Write a protein that binds this ligand. Sequence first.
Ligand SMILES: C[S@@+](CC[C@H](N)C(=O)[O-])C[C@H]1O[C@@H](n2cnc3c(N)ncnc32)[C@H](O)[C@@H]1O
Ligand SMILES: C[S@@+](CC[C@H](N)C(=O)[O-])C[C@H]1O[C@@H](n2cnc3c(N)ncnc32)[C@H](O)[C@@H]1O
Ligand SMILES: Nc1nc2c(c(=O)[nH]1)N[C@@H](C(=O)O)CN2
Ligand SMILES: Nc1nc2c(c(=O)[nH]1)N[C@@H](C(=O)O)CN2
Ligand code: SF4
Ligand code: SF4
Ligand code: NA
Ligand code: NA
Ligand code: NA
Lengths: 209, 209
Amino acid sequence: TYAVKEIFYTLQGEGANAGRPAVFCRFAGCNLWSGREEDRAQAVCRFCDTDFVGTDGENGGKFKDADALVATIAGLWPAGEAHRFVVCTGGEPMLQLDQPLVDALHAAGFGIAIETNGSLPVLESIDWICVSPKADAPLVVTKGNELKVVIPQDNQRLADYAKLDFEYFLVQPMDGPSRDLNTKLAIDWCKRHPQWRLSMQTHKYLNIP
Amino acid sequence: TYAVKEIFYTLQGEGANAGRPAVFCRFAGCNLWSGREEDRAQAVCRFCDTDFVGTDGENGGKFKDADALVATIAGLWPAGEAHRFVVCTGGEPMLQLDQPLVDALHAAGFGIAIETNGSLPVLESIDWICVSPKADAPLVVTKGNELKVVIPQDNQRLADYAKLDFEYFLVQPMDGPSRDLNTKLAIDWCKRHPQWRLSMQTHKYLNIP
Ligand SMILES: C[S@@+](CC[C@H](N)C(=O)[O-])C[C@H]1O[C@@H](n2cnc3c(N)ncnc32)[C@H](O)[C@@H]1O
Ligand SMILES: C[S@@+](CC[C@H](N)C(=O)[O-])C[C@H]1O[C@@H](n2cnc3c(N)ncnc32)[C@H](O)[C@@H]1O
Ligand SMILES: Nc1nc2c(c(=O)[nH]1)N[C@@H](C(=O)O)CN2
Ligand SMILES: Nc1nc2c(c(=O)[nH]1)N[C@@H](C(=O)O)CN2
Ligand code: SF4
Ligand code: SF4
Ligand code: NA
Ligand code: NA
Ligand code: NA
Protein backbone atom coordinates (compact mmCIF):
# COMPACT_ATOMS: atom_id res chain seq x y z
CA THR A 1 0.00 0.00 0.00
CA TYR A 2 1.25 3.48 -1.01
CA ALA A 3 0.42 6.86 0.50
CA VAL A 4 0.87 9.47 -2.24
CA LYS A 5 0.60 13.24 -1.73
CA GLU A 6 0.32 14.15 -5.41
CA ILE A 7 1.02 12.89 -8.93
CA PHE A 8 1.48 15.40 -11.76
CA TYR A 9 2.98 15.80 -15.22
CA THR A 10 5.51 18.60 -15.77
CA LEU A 11 9.18 19.21 -16.65
CA GLN A 12 11.85 18.09 -14.16
CA GLY A 13 13.03 21.40 -12.76
CA GLU A 14 16.29 20.25 -11.17
CA GLY A 15 19.51 18.31 -11.61
CA ALA A 16 21.08 16.83 -14.72
CA ASN A 17 17.61 15.97 -16.10
CA ALA A 18 16.31 19.56 -15.81
CA GLY A 19 13.95 20.34 -18.67
CA ARG A 20 12.87 16.73 -19.23
CA PRO A 21 9.14 15.83 -19.31
CA ALA A 22 8.30 13.61 -16.35
CA VAL A 23 5.44 12.36 -14.23
CA PHE A 24 6.21 13.26 -10.61
CA CYS A 25 5.02 10.79 -8.01
CA ARG A 26 5.32 12.59 -4.67
CA PHE A 27 5.06 10.12 -1.79
CA ALA A 28 3.68 11.31 1.55
CA GLY A 29 5.96 11.38 4.59
CA CYS A 30 9.66 11.81 5.30
CA ASN A 31 12.09 10.39 7.85
CA LEU A 32 13.93 13.67 8.48
CA TRP A 33 10.93 15.94 9.15
CA SER A 34 7.35 15.34 10.25
CA GLY A 35 6.20 17.96 7.73
CA ARG A 36 4.55 19.97 10.52
CA GLU A 37 5.72 23.58 10.80
CA GLU A 38 5.69 23.21 14.60
CA ASP A 39 8.43 20.61 14.24
CA ARG A 40 10.57 22.35 11.63
CA ALA A 41 12.83 24.25 14.03
CA GLN A 42 13.93 20.99 15.73
CA ALA A 43 14.02 18.66 12.71
CA VAL A 44 17.01 16.86 11.18
CA CYS A 45 16.15 18.52 7.85
CA ARG A 46 14.90 22.06 8.44
CA PHE A 47 14.87 23.82 5.06
CA CYS A 48 12.31 21.77 3.11
CA ASP A 49 10.39 23.70 0.42
CA THR A 50 7.74 20.99 -0.05
CA ASP A 51 4.30 19.93 1.24
CA PHE A 52 4.43 16.14 1.66
CA VAL A 53 1.81 15.67 4.40
CA GLY A 54 -1.27 13.59 3.65
CA THR A 55 -2.73 12.27 0.42
CA ASP A 56 -4.88 15.23 -0.59
CA GLY A 57 -3.01 16.75 -3.52
CA GLU A 58 -3.69 16.34 -7.23
CA ASN A 59 -4.26 12.61 -7.94
CA GLY A 60 -3.14 11.93 -4.38
CA GLY A 61 -4.48 9.05 -2.34
CA LYS A 62 -3.83 5.67 -0.81
CA PHE A 63 -3.12 3.15 -3.56
CA LYS A 64 -3.90 -0.47 -2.72
CA ASP A 65 -1.17 -1.93 -4.96
CA ALA A 66 1.57 -1.14 -7.47
CA ASP A 67 -0.76 -1.71 -10.44
CA ALA A 68 -3.23 0.93 -9.21
CA LEU A 69 -0.43 3.48 -8.80
CA VAL A 70 1.19 2.71 -12.16
CA ALA A 71 -2.21 3.06 -13.86
CA THR A 72 -2.57 6.61 -12.52
CA ILE A 73 1.02 7.54 -13.35
CA ALA A 74 0.67 6.08 -16.86
CA GLY A 75 -2.62 7.92 -17.37
CA LEU A 76 -0.84 11.27 -17.20
CA TRP A 77 1.52 10.47 -20.06
CA PRO A 78 0.58 11.85 -23.50
CA ALA A 79 -1.26 9.24 -25.56
CA GLY A 80 0.90 7.56 -28.18
CA GLU A 81 4.16 9.04 -26.91
CA ALA A 82 7.13 7.08 -25.63
CA HIS A 83 10.10 8.27 -23.54
CA ARG A 84 8.05 7.62 -20.40
CA PHE A 85 9.84 8.95 -17.34
CA VAL A 86 8.74 9.11 -13.71
CA VAL A 87 10.40 10.93 -10.85
CA CYS A 88 9.75 9.25 -7.50
CA THR A 89 10.04 11.86 -4.78
CA GLY A 90 8.25 13.10 -1.64
CA GLY A 91 8.76 13.22 1.19
CA GLU A 92 11.36 10.48 1.30
CA PRO A 93 10.46 8.02 -1.48
CA MET A 94 12.61 5.19 -0.08
CA LEU A 95 10.18 4.89 2.83
CA GLN A 96 7.72 3.36 0.32
CA LEU A 97 9.25 2.71 -3.12
CA ASP A 98 9.74 -1.06 -3.41
CA GLN A 99 10.76 -3.67 -5.99
CA PRO A 100 7.17 -4.45 -7.01
CA LEU A 101 6.49 -0.78 -7.85
CA VAL A 102 9.83 -0.51 -9.64
CA ASP A 103 9.04 -3.67 -11.64
CA ALA A 104 5.51 -2.52 -12.52
CA LEU A 105 6.77 0.90 -13.67
CA HIS A 106 9.40 -0.77 -15.86
CA ALA A 107 6.82 -3.13 -17.35
CA ALA A 108 4.72 -0.08 -18.26
CA GLY A 109 7.67 1.34 -20.19
CA PHE A 110 8.80 3.94 -17.65
CA GLY A 111 12.35 4.97 -16.93
CA ILE A 112 12.56 5.64 -13.19
CA ALA A 113 14.29 8.45 -11.35
CA ILE A 114 14.41 8.96 -7.62
CA GLU A 115 14.98 12.05 -5.47
CA THR A 116 16.31 10.74 -2.15
CA ASN A 117 18.00 12.27 0.90
CA GLY A 118 20.48 9.37 0.95
CA SER A 119 19.80 8.36 4.55
CA LEU A 120 18.18 5.07 3.45
CA PRO A 121 19.27 2.24 1.12
CA VAL A 122 18.12 2.70 -2.45
CA LEU A 123 17.00 0.03 -4.95
CA GLU A 124 19.76 -0.27 -7.53
CA SER A 125 17.33 -1.27 -10.31
CA ILE A 126 16.20 2.40 -10.29
CA ASP A 127 17.44 3.97 -13.55
CA TRP A 128 18.43 7.41 -12.30
CA ILE A 129 19.51 7.94 -8.70
CA CYS A 130 19.72 11.51 -7.43
CA VAL A 131 20.96 11.85 -3.84
CA SER A 132 20.67 15.12 -1.89
CA PRO A 133 22.61 14.70 1.37
CA LYS A 134 21.40 16.46 4.51
CA ALA A 135 24.26 17.67 6.71
CA ASP A 136 22.82 16.34 9.99
CA ALA A 137 21.58 12.94 8.70
CA PRO A 138 23.51 9.73 8.02
CA LEU A 139 24.54 9.31 4.37
CA VAL A 140 24.38 5.62 3.47
CA VAL A 141 23.92 6.01 -0.29
CA THR A 142 27.42 6.76 -1.55
CA LYS A 143 27.00 5.89 -5.22
CA GLY A 144 24.50 6.99 -7.82
CA ASN A 145 24.02 9.09 -10.90
CA GLU A 146 23.97 12.59 -9.42
CA LEU A 147 24.83 14.00 -6.04
CA LYS A 148 22.82 17.21 -5.73
CA VAL A 149 23.85 19.13 -2.64
CA VAL A 150 21.69 21.99 -1.35
CA ILE A 151 23.95 24.79 -0.06
CA PRO A 152 24.68 26.34 2.31
CA GLN A 153 23.94 24.06 5.27
CA ASP A 154 25.81 24.37 8.60
CA ASN A 155 28.13 21.45 9.44
CA GLN A 156 28.56 20.80 5.73
CA ARG A 157 31.69 19.10 4.40
CA LEU A 158 31.14 20.01 0.78
CA ALA A 159 34.48 19.21 -0.84
CA ASP A 160 34.42 15.76 0.80
CA TYR A 161 31.24 14.86 -1.15
CA ALA A 162 33.24 15.02 -4.39
CA LYS A 163 35.07 11.88 -3.30
CA LEU A 164 31.93 9.78 -3.66
CA ASP A 165 30.96 7.51 -6.57
CA PHE A 166 28.60 9.70 -8.65
CA GLU A 167 28.58 10.72 -12.32
CA TYR A 168 27.56 14.31 -11.60
CA PHE A 169 28.27 16.58 -8.64
CA LEU A 170 25.86 19.49 -8.31
CA VAL A 171 25.19 22.32 -5.89
CA GLN A 172 21.67 23.72 -5.61
CA PRO A 173 21.08 27.06 -3.89
CA MET A 174 18.87 26.88 -0.82
CA ASP A 175 15.59 28.63 -1.50
CA GLY A 176 14.17 30.86 1.20
CA PRO A 177 14.88 34.48 2.26
CA SER A 178 18.46 34.22 0.93
CA ARG A 179 17.93 32.46 -2.42
CA ASP A 180 19.73 35.15 -4.44
CA LEU A 181 22.64 35.22 -1.99
CA ASN A 182 22.87 31.43 -2.00
CA THR A 183 22.74 31.39 -5.78
CA LYS A 184 25.79 33.65 -5.96
CA LEU A 185 27.55 31.38 -3.42
CA ALA A 186 26.76 28.34 -5.52
CA ILE A 187 27.94 29.90 -8.77
CA ASP A 188 31.20 30.93 -7.10
CA TRP A 189 31.71 27.43 -5.66
CA CYS A 190 31.44 25.78 -9.08
CA LYS A 191 33.75 28.32 -10.69
CA ARG A 192 36.37 27.68 -8.01
CA HIS A 193 35.88 23.92 -7.95
CA PRO A 194 34.72 23.02 -11.46
CA GLN A 195 34.13 19.38 -10.66
CA TRP A 196 30.85 20.88 -9.42
CA ARG A 197 28.00 22.10 -11.61
CA LEU A 198 25.04 24.35 -10.74
CA SER A 199 21.52 22.96 -10.29
CA MET A 200 18.88 25.71 -10.48
CA GLN A 201 15.33 25.09 -9.37
CA THR A 202 14.18 26.10 -12.85
CA HIS A 203 10.50 25.39 -12.26
CA LYS A 204 10.46 28.32 -9.82
CA TYR A 205 11.82 30.61 -12.54
CA LEU A 206 9.48 29.22 -15.17
CA ASN A 207 6.59 29.24 -12.69
CA ILE A 208 5.46 25.72 -13.60
CA PRO A 209 4.51 22.92 -11.17
CA THR B 1 45.25 33.12 -37.20
CA TYR B 2 42.00 33.56 -35.20
CA ALA B 3 39.70 36.55 -34.78
CA VAL B 4 38.13 36.32 -31.33
CA LYS B 5 35.44 38.65 -30.03
CA GLU B 6 35.78 37.67 -26.36
CA ILE B 7 36.99 34.93 -24.03
CA PHE B 8 35.43 34.59 -20.58
CA TYR B 9 35.00 32.10 -17.75
CA THR B 10 31.47 31.34 -16.54
CA LEU B 11 28.86 28.56 -16.34
CA GLN B 12 27.37 27.20 -19.58
CA GLY B 13 23.86 28.68 -19.51
CA GLU B 14 22.27 26.43 -22.13
CA GLY B 15 21.65 22.91 -23.36
CA ALA B 16 22.48 19.58 -21.73
CA ASN B 17 25.63 21.04 -20.13
CA ALA B 18 23.81 23.96 -18.47
CA GLY B 19 25.36 24.72 -15.08
CA ARG B 20 28.82 23.47 -16.07
CA PRO B 21 31.90 25.67 -15.58
CA ALA B 22 33.35 26.57 -18.96
CA VAL B 23 35.65 28.97 -20.75
CA PHE B 24 33.72 30.56 -23.62
CA CYS B 25 35.72 31.38 -26.71
CA ARG B 26 33.51 33.59 -28.86
CA PHE B 27 34.83 33.82 -32.40
CA ALA B 28 34.11 36.96 -34.38
CA GLY B 29 31.99 36.67 -37.50
CA CYS B 30 29.09 34.55 -38.76
CA ASN B 31 28.02 33.25 -42.16
CA LEU B 32 24.28 33.81 -41.63
CA TRP B 33 24.36 37.47 -40.51
CA SER B 34 26.88 40.31 -40.78
CA GLY B 35 26.21 41.30 -37.19
CA ARG B 36 25.10 44.75 -38.37
CA GLU B 37 21.60 45.89 -37.29
CA GLU B 38 20.93 47.44 -40.73
CA ASP B 39 21.38 43.96 -42.24
CA ARG B 40 19.36 41.98 -39.69
CA ALA B 41 16.03 42.27 -41.53
CA GLN B 42 17.55 40.72 -44.67
CA ALA B 43 19.78 38.11 -43.00
CA VAL B 44 19.41 34.36 -43.18
CA CYS B 45 19.49 34.26 -39.34
CA ARG B 46 17.53 37.22 -38.02
CA PHE B 47 16.97 36.56 -34.31
CA CYS B 48 20.56 36.56 -32.95
CA ASP B 49 20.97 37.79 -29.34
CA THR B 50 24.75 38.11 -29.57
CA ASP B 51 27.42 40.69 -30.40
CA PHE B 52 30.09 38.89 -32.45
CA VAL B 53 31.43 41.89 -34.36
CA GLY B 54 35.10 42.74 -34.03
CA THR B 55 37.78 41.70 -31.58
CA ASP B 56 37.19 44.25 -28.81
CA GLY B 57 35.52 42.26 -26.04
CA GLU B 58 37.06 40.86 -22.86
CA ASN B 59 40.32 39.07 -23.86
CA GLY B 60 39.26 39.46 -27.48
CA GLY B 61 41.75 39.94 -30.28
CA LYS B 62 43.57 38.54 -33.27
CA PHE B 63 45.58 35.49 -32.25
CA LYS B 64 48.86 34.63 -33.98
CA ASP B 65 48.37 30.88 -33.75
CA ALA B 66 46.63 28.10 -31.84
CA ASP B 67 49.20 28.17 -29.02
CA ALA B 68 48.56 31.86 -28.32
CA LEU B 69 44.81 31.30 -28.14
CA VAL B 70 45.03 28.19 -25.97
CA ALA B 71 47.35 30.10 -23.61
CA THR B 72 44.66 32.72 -23.00
CA ILE B 73 41.91 30.13 -22.63
CA ALA B 74 43.92 27.99 -20.20
CA GLY B 75 44.89 31.12 -18.30
CA LEU B 76 41.26 31.70 -17.33
CA TRP B 77 40.92 28.26 -15.71
CA PRO B 78 41.34 28.08 -11.92
CA ALA B 79 44.91 27.07 -11.09
CA GLY B 80 45.38 23.43 -10.15
CA GLU B 81 41.82 22.42 -10.99
CA ALA B 82 40.98 19.85 -13.64
CA HIS B 83 37.71 19.29 -15.57
CA ARG B 84 38.83 21.86 -18.14
CA PHE B 85 36.07 22.62 -20.60
CA VAL B 86 35.85 25.18 -23.39
CA VAL B 87 32.77 26.15 -25.37
CA CYS B 88 33.70 27.31 -28.86
CA THR B 89 31.03 29.67 -30.10
CA GLY B 90 30.59 33.03 -31.81
CA GLY B 91 29.61 34.03 -34.29
CA GLU B 92 29.87 30.78 -36.25
CA PRO B 93 32.87 28.94 -34.80
CA MET B 94 33.24 26.60 -37.77
CA LEU B 95 34.38 29.58 -39.82
CA GLN B 96 37.63 29.46 -37.84
CA LEU B 97 37.89 26.42 -35.57
CA ASP B 98 40.44 24.10 -37.21
CA GLN B 99 42.18 20.84 -36.30
CA PRO B 100 45.37 22.47 -34.95
CA LEU B 101 43.32 24.48 -32.41
CA VAL B 102 41.32 21.39 -31.43
CA ASP B 103 44.54 19.37 -31.02
CA ALA B 104 46.17 22.14 -28.97
CA LEU B 105 43.13 22.45 -26.70
CA HIS B 106 43.15 18.68 -26.19
CA ALA B 107 46.87 18.69 -25.40
CA ALA B 108 46.15 21.32 -22.73
CA GLY B 109 43.63 18.95 -21.16
CA PHE B 110 40.44 20.70 -22.32
CA GLY B 111 37.24 18.92 -23.26
CA ILE B 112 35.82 20.84 -26.24
CA ALA B 113 32.21 21.82 -26.91
CA ILE B 114 30.92 23.66 -29.93
CA GLU B 115 27.82 25.79 -30.51
CA THR B 116 27.20 25.75 -34.27
CA ASN B 117 24.35 26.74 -36.58
CA GLY B 118 24.80 23.47 -38.48
CA SER B 119 25.31 25.03 -41.92
CA LEU B 120 29.02 24.13 -42.00
CA PRO B 121 30.83 20.79 -41.63
CA VAL B 122 32.08 20.19 -38.08
CA LEU B 123 35.30 18.62 -36.82
CA GLU B 124 34.26 15.26 -35.48
CA SER B 125 37.12 15.20 -32.97
CA ILE B 126 35.18 17.86 -31.04
CA ASP B 127 33.94 16.25 -27.80
CA TRP B 128 30.52 17.87 -27.52
CA ILE B 129 28.66 18.99 -30.64
CA CYS B 130 25.61 21.22 -30.16
CA VAL B 131 23.77 22.08 -33.40
CA SER B 132 21.15 24.86 -33.48
CA PRO B 133 19.46 24.80 -36.89
CA LYS B 134 18.23 28.01 -38.51
CA ALA B 135 15.03 27.37 -40.44
CA ASP B 136 16.00 29.37 -43.55
CA ALA B 137 19.60 28.03 -43.69
CA PRO B 138 20.83 24.65 -44.96
CA LEU B 139 21.40 22.01 -42.30
CA VAL B 140 24.44 19.91 -43.26
CA VAL B 141 25.28 18.62 -39.77
CA THR B 142 22.75 15.90 -39.07
CA LYS B 143 24.44 14.09 -36.19
CA GLY B 144 25.94 15.26 -32.94
CA ASN B 145 25.40 15.27 -29.20
CA GLU B 146 22.53 17.75 -28.85
CA LEU B 147 20.19 19.40 -31.33
CA LYS B 148 19.06 22.61 -29.63
CA VAL B 149 16.31 24.21 -31.72
CA VAL B 150 15.31 27.81 -31.03
CA ILE B 151 11.53 28.19 -31.30
CA PRO B 152 9.39 29.47 -32.82
CA GLN B 153 10.84 30.07 -36.30
CA ASP B 154 8.78 30.39 -39.47
CA ASN B 155 9.29 27.56 -42.01
CA GLN B 156 10.25 25.14 -39.22
CA ARG B 157 9.62 21.40 -39.49
CA LEU B 158 10.17 20.95 -35.78
CA ALA B 159 8.83 17.44 -35.24
CA ASP B 160 10.95 16.13 -38.16
CA TYR B 161 14.19 17.26 -36.48
CA ALA B 162 13.66 14.32 -34.14
CA LYS B 163 14.60 11.96 -36.98
CA LEU B 164 18.22 13.17 -36.96
CA ASP B 165 21.09 11.40 -35.16
CA PHE B 166 21.49 13.23 -31.83
CA GLU B 167 21.56 12.09 -28.19
CA TYR B 168 19.43 15.01 -26.97
CA PHE B 169 16.67 16.99 -28.65
CA LEU B 170 16.00 20.38 -27.05
CA VAL B 171 13.83 23.39 -27.69
CA GLN B 172 15.04 26.79 -26.57
CA PRO B 173 12.62 29.73 -26.35
CA MET B 174 13.50 32.65 -28.62
CA ASP B 175 14.56 35.64 -26.51
CA GLY B 176 13.30 39.06 -27.51
CA PRO B 177 10.02 40.87 -26.83
CA SER B 178 8.10 37.56 -26.70
CA ARG B 179 10.38 35.48 -24.44
CA ASP B 180 7.72 34.57 -21.87
CA LEU B 181 5.26 33.68 -24.64
CA ASN B 182 7.83 31.51 -26.41
CA THR B 183 8.79 29.88 -23.10
CA LYS B 184 5.17 28.79 -22.63
CA LEU B 185 5.10 27.44 -26.23
CA ALA B 186 8.31 25.52 -25.64
CA ILE B 187 7.13 23.94 -22.37
CA ASP B 188 3.90 22.89 -24.07
CA TRP B 189 5.83 21.40 -26.99
CA CYS B 190 7.96 19.20 -24.71
CA LYS B 191 4.95 18.07 -22.68
CA ARG B 192 3.13 17.16 -25.88
CA HIS B 193 6.19 15.53 -27.49
CA PRO B 194 8.37 14.30 -24.63
CA GLN B 195 11.26 13.21 -26.79
CA TRP B 196 12.04 16.93 -26.51
CA ARG B 197 13.42 18.67 -23.45
CA LEU B 198 13.46 22.36 -22.53
CA SER B 199 16.67 24.38 -22.81
CA MET B 200 16.46 27.63 -20.79
CA GLN B 201 18.95 30.43 -21.23
CA THR B 202 19.75 30.18 -17.51
CA HIS B 203 22.52 32.78 -17.59
CA LYS B 204 19.84 35.40 -18.35
CA TYR B 205 17.86 34.37 -15.27
CA LEU B 206 21.01 34.16 -13.13
CA ASN B 207 22.34 37.43 -14.57
CA ILE B 208 25.84 36.03 -15.18
CA PRO B 209 28.07 36.35 -18.28
C1 LIG C 1 11.59 17.80 -1.41
S1 LIG C 1 13.03 16.82 -1.51
C2 LIG C 1 12.25 15.21 -1.62
C3 LIG C 1 13.26 14.10 -1.97
C4 LIG C 1 14.11 13.65 -0.76
N1 LIG C 1 13.35 13.72 0.51
C5 LIG C 1 15.36 14.58 -0.74
O1 LIG C 1 15.44 15.39 0.21
O2 LIG C 1 16.19 14.43 -1.65
C6 LIG C 1 13.44 17.09 -3.27
C7 LIG C 1 14.66 18.02 -3.53
O3 LIG C 1 14.39 19.39 -3.11
C8 LIG C 1 15.53 19.85 -2.41
N2 LIG C 1 15.13 20.98 -1.58
C9 LIG C 1 14.33 20.93 -0.48
N3 LIG C 1 14.14 22.09 0.10
C10 LIG C 1 14.87 22.97 -0.68
C11 LIG C 1 15.09 24.36 -0.60
N4 LIG C 1 14.57 25.14 0.37
N5 LIG C 1 15.88 24.93 -1.54
C12 LIG C 1 16.41 24.16 -2.49
N6 LIG C 1 16.26 22.84 -2.68
C13 LIG C 1 15.48 22.30 -1.73
C14 LIG C 1 16.01 18.62 -1.64
O4 LIG C 1 17.34 18.72 -1.14
C15 LIG C 1 15.89 17.56 -2.74
O5 LIG C 1 17.05 17.58 -3.57
C1 LIG D 1 24.85 33.07 -30.70
S1 LIG D 1 24.73 31.44 -31.37
C2 LIG D 1 26.44 31.17 -31.79
C3 LIG D 1 26.72 29.75 -32.37
C4 LIG D 1 26.10 29.57 -33.78
N1 LIG D 1 26.04 30.86 -34.52
C5 LIG D 1 24.65 29.02 -33.56
O1 LIG D 1 23.75 29.77 -34.01
O2 LIG D 1 24.47 27.93 -32.98
C6 LIG D 1 24.66 30.53 -29.78
C7 LIG D 1 23.28 29.94 -29.39
O3 LIG D 1 22.33 30.97 -29.03
C8 LIG D 1 21.11 30.73 -29.70
N2 LIG D 1 20.39 31.98 -29.83
C9 LIG D 1 20.71 33.03 -30.65
N3 LIG D 1 19.87 34.03 -30.59
C10 LIG D 1 18.92 33.61 -29.67
C11 LIG D 1 17.74 34.21 -29.19
N4 LIG D 1 17.29 35.41 -29.59
N5 LIG D 1 17.01 33.52 -28.29
C12 LIG D 1 17.44 32.31 -27.90
N6 LIG D 1 18.53 31.65 -28.29
C13 LIG D 1 19.23 32.35 -29.19
C14 LIG D 1 21.53 30.11 -31.03
O4 LIG D 1 20.47 29.41 -31.67
C15 LIG D 1 22.62 29.15 -30.54
O5 LIG D 1 22.04 27.95 -30.05
N1 LIG E 1 9.06 20.82 -11.95
C1 LIG E 1 9.46 20.37 -10.76
N2 LIG E 1 10.61 19.72 -10.65
C2 LIG E 1 10.90 19.30 -9.40
C3 LIG E 1 10.07 19.53 -8.29
C4 LIG E 1 8.88 20.23 -8.40
O1 LIG E 1 8.10 20.53 -7.49
N3 LIG E 1 8.63 20.62 -9.70
N4 LIG E 1 10.34 19.05 -7.01
C5 LIG E 1 11.58 18.31 -6.79
C6 LIG E 1 11.20 17.17 -5.84
O2 LIG E 1 10.39 17.43 -4.92
O3 LIG E 1 11.71 16.06 -6.06
C7 LIG E 1 12.31 17.82 -8.07
N5 LIG E 1 12.11 18.62 -9.27
N1 LIG F 1 26.70 31.70 -19.66
C1 LIG F 1 26.48 31.74 -20.97
N2 LIG F 1 26.19 30.62 -21.63
C2 LIG F 1 26.05 30.75 -22.97
C3 LIG F 1 26.19 31.96 -23.64
C4 LIG F 1 26.48 33.15 -22.95
O1 LIG F 1 26.60 34.28 -23.43
N3 LIG F 1 26.61 32.94 -21.59
N4 LIG F 1 26.07 32.07 -25.03
C5 LIG F 1 25.73 30.89 -25.81
C6 LIG F 1 26.60 30.98 -27.07
O2 LIG F 1 26.68 32.11 -27.60
O3 LIG F 1 27.16 29.94 -27.49
C7 LIG F 1 25.90 29.53 -25.09
N5 LIG F 1 25.76 29.55 -23.64
S1 SF4 G 1 14.63 15.08 3.55
FE1 SF4 G 1 13.74 15.80 1.54
S2 SF4 G 1 11.47 15.65 1.81
FE2 SF4 G 1 12.41 15.37 3.88
S3 SF4 G 1 12.28 17.39 4.83
FE3 SF4 G 1 14.31 17.30 3.84
S4 SF4 G 1 14.04 18.08 1.69
FE4 SF4 G 1 11.98 17.72 2.57
S1 SF4 H 1 23.88 31.73 -36.88
FE1 SF4 H 1 24.38 31.83 -34.62
S2 SF4 H 1 25.88 33.62 -34.41
FE2 SF4 H 1 24.99 33.68 -36.54
S3 SF4 H 1 23.38 35.23 -36.38
FE3 SF4 H 1 22.40 33.21 -36.02
S4 SF4 H 1 22.49 32.78 -33.76
FE4 SF4 H 1 23.87 34.57 -34.22
NA1 NA I 1 9.59 20.20 -4.51
NA1 NA J 1 25.12 34.37 -26.50
NA1 NA K 1 6.93 27.66 -36.74
